[PDB]
Symmetry: C5
Subunit: 265 residues, 5 copies
Amino acid sequence: NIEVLNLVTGPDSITTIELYLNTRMGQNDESKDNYGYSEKVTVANSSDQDKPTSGEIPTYSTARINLPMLNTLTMWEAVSVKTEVVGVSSLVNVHMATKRMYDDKGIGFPVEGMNFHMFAVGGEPLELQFLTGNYRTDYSANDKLVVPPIKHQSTQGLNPHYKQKLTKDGAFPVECWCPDPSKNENTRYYGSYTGGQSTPPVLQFTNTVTTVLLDENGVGPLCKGDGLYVSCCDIVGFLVGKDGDMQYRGLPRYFNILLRKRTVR
Amino acid sequence: NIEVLNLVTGPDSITTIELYLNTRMGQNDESKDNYGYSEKVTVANSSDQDKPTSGEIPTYSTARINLPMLEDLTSNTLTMWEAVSVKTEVVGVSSLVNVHMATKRMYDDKGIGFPVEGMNFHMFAVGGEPLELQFLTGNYRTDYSANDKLVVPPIKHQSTQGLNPHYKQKLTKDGAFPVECWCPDPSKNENTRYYGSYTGGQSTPPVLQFTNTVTTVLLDENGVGPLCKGDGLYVSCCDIVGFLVGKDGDMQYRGLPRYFNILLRKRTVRN
Amino acid sequence: IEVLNLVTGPDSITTIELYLNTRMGQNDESKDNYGYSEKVTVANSSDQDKPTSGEIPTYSTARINLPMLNNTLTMWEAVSVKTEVVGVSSLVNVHMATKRMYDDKGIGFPVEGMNFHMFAVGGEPLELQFLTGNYRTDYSANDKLVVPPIKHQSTQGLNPHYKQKLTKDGAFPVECWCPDPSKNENTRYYGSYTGGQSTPPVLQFTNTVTTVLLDENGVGPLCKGDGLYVSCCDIVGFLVGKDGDMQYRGLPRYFNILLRKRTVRN
Amino acid sequence: NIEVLNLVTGPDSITTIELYLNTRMGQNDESKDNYGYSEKVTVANSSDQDKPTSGEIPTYSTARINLPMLNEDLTSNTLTMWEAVSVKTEVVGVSSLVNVHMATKRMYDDKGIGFPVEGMNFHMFAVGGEPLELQFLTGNYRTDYSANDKLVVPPIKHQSTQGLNPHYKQKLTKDGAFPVECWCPDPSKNENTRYYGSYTGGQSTPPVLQFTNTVTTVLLDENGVGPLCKGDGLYVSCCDIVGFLVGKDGDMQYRGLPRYFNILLRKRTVRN
Amino acid sequence: IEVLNLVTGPDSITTIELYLNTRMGQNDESKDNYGYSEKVTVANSSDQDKPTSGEIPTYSTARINLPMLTLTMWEAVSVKTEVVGVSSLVNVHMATKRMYDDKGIGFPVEGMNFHMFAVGGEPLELQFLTGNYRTDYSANDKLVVPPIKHQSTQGLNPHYKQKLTKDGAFPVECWCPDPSKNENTRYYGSYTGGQSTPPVLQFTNTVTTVLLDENGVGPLCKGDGLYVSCCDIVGFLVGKDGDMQYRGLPRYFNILLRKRTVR
Ligand SMILES: [Cl-]
Ligand SMILES: [Mg+2]
């Protein structure tokens, strides 16, 4: 829709945005115990009685950042991002109150199992597609979650009638919303999933890696209304309590985004 | 062999095709429960009584897309659409972040439900004609007759546990060709690019990625992409991400959809 | 061979396309269990280690006759190869008569465990070195296998007195023959092994990868007597029967080899 | 903050710093048994009674190295600083893990190998022109560090520290004192440090390690500028956990290895 | 050594080809258990940790005499190296523990992998570092170990060094490359641990490893000697009763050298 023209050169043609997003694993109140974890996971008796408890399901983190006001028009173009998962070293901890190895003599189980890492940087809200492992999942224990008002069998595949935009932090469940690959022309997203039961988390952290956000035409996300949208989720595994009760553990993500002025029609 | 000449230049010389294919794990009716999963897996008592139930077998997804028409067949040259590149992603990976479904669970019924896990199989193909298939099976005696909508050879022979070039097909129907007995024919498919991976074992962690930033070049070593015969683009895939483990241990394949964004350009060829 | 200039122009290039079926031990395409070994057995002791007939994988190999060409002569020079394992999707099968997960309610065990993948392209037979995990292994249950006529302790390491050439399909056991790194000047070989008991097979297939066969001097394998030699082995794991009996499973390999005419001195 | 100008050329415009850092797994006294290991790991009865024993928790290794002294003044138009260009770093003693006869739990009904050191791996190093800047973040905000008053931890605890609370920061200024479990590199700072880290978790996971003397890590940033050494100090930090030793009765200790560094530095003119 | 120009022309190049057999503990090609260690034993306590004779792997090493030659020295430019006999691990019928209630495959050789090689113009320089400072090596007086033991050797104590001057004698468990020296050697190593871990191995004759440093200079062969060192552990053989032995494989080397003028 936007006809892109030349870069604006010279002084004040560049700016940087720095932020972090804290994890939204389910206990999302920084004043309460278990912050940065989910509530204890529960398991449906049957697929038609699959009703997660309030706070046991991870959601996307997201923010809109206001950019410096500008005026053809000029827009901020996101060129690149340096992003890191924060607190990886916190997983070097095997003395927490957990199940333990070797007949109660060995280490406590570290946080381990399923990893899920995604981030997105764009010039408008991340566009979502609904897709679930169980179309019958009942989200009514927590009315602050944003989910479709109707359920249908077809949502176990891609039904393009079920879409959304990621416009609220800590509200859109990761289990039923993914990036919409048919849209997001003005957003870059990257994600990975490593599953299984007790799988080793495999994580890296460095301040030396720059991710280029320019597309194949050399154009980055263009920030509509001078808003920059950043979204993520970083699940690093489960904490296994003494009795076998399990909670998701998430970590924060840091972003340093470089933007430049771009003339558009 | 098509003799390739120059690229056609100018504003109308490029087009893009966008589509998705839903998974064909065995329950392939979007109006019914268990859509995007297989029916429960069953296990043969013996190799001569190996008869999968209807709906327990994954099949390839496929579509033919009609491209913009390009009419003179009496000239020295013709124009064809050439597929240059594709951006393709597995959709709904985040749906696997779910451990509260009605499943077997960890740690003496106190821990998480088992996530979808185990065997992964991922393949896609983009070509200017149907994907050409070779028959090869783990069990030549497999009996597919519980589901007469599957496309399989009418005769069975011991040699089909290896490569018998008398047993070939083309992928011409969505949700009908079992992945277990049909693979890409490497002796053909000159006008298709295919990429596949398999990670097996029992409860193996799925390892998946999704991004809208990766472009797969479809040009061959001579700089020529698939040429779309009869202005048809053929897209095929399969994306198994593991098994759902029910409370009693019963298991079903789980598949995910795949998205494709294909860039094509006009190419002059000799007629 | 003293190598001279490339021959240019029309008909200076040719391609050879073939497949090799796996030689896991049941190597008769008319019989049940083709593409698998016979059931694996285990030695009572290292001094009585006698594999049953058909339980041991062997190399696949072929010599392909090239177009006749022939002071100087012309030889075919192998430039590159596109090679793929065929039938990987056949491993998406968990309903065969196998051991199964979760108290006989879950999937059948897929083919899983040890993987071994190697291919070689050369202008003469692949040169082999003998090396075994057990110098005492007794191969006499199958007199069609090619093994050294005498055994010695030292063959658990590299004893250069024990060599061979891969001249017969389905006959040289992989367990005791490997490529001889001190020879094979006119062959390129590539291999990998992933072991363990029930290890996930990790496999790829594509028609988009070209392997260059030219050496560091820009010279490919030169085909002596207009013969191209192709060898491989592709073990993708074990099939686990209901009672725990196991068989190797192998898959075929496809090859598309590009060759060019090269002038050499006679 | 520092405006970088041209490289200084000529004699003594280059210098190299070579050092090693020994691991700080918890038994950090080279004269005592169990050096290079933690004390035995213990497990909290509950999250509000989570008090690691003295010596059971790994800390960062760190040193400040004096560089050849340069002029510092407020009057001169330019100054010279040392710029770290590159580092060659390796984990030392990887082959020490080829040992399965130590007094450990063993495989196959007491007939097989002793368990090798295995499990959790954590590897990080940093090279900078000032102390590594740390962010506090913990798996348990209530962790009680009072069994060892030599550890540097925040004096106040709060629920928010299970995420990123930017009010809780520090600088890595003491060897063997900052727990890895609650301090990580602060990504919002460290403009003048390069750091690299990895974690591989799980219970008995195979350690996967490499060692070579052939790899040079470039420390220049995207603008071609390396860490600039304030007060002619070079700061080197690391941690290298290679797993756990499993005693006969199942008691477990962290095992760490030393890290070697060879850092090349050059003189850089900066605006004063 | 002040390095000057390359010598050009015919006979300015030579190649050295060799293999080294593994030194897993039984190192005599005429005797039982060749190419394996003796059975692994386990210390009752850390102060009674005394490996049996032959149960511990050592480095393989050789010094190769080069053609006799300001002065001229041989400079090692590159090496092609491969582990030999990888296919020997495709064997599950040996007398071993077996899967599935005595019906399944014999356990393949599996577990710990350790692979290192070094090429240099002088002996590989070693640093002592051990998991247990008290380890008692006196069951085998042919091993080269320090004469004194000290607590500090569980870390890096630079007072404990050596040079790899004898094949089949320096235990891998207590000697590693000294990163503070070895300016005239290139070394590469990896370790994959755990209990029953799958060996992951490759072999090809198509890979050349460049030995030149960042200044374009390869190892310079002092006294016309080329030093080659390695170790290649591919796992453990698990006997019927659970007794385990290290298994090693040989390594092949093809080294290209060129004449270099030096002051
Ligand atoms: Cl100065
Ligand atoms: Mg040095």
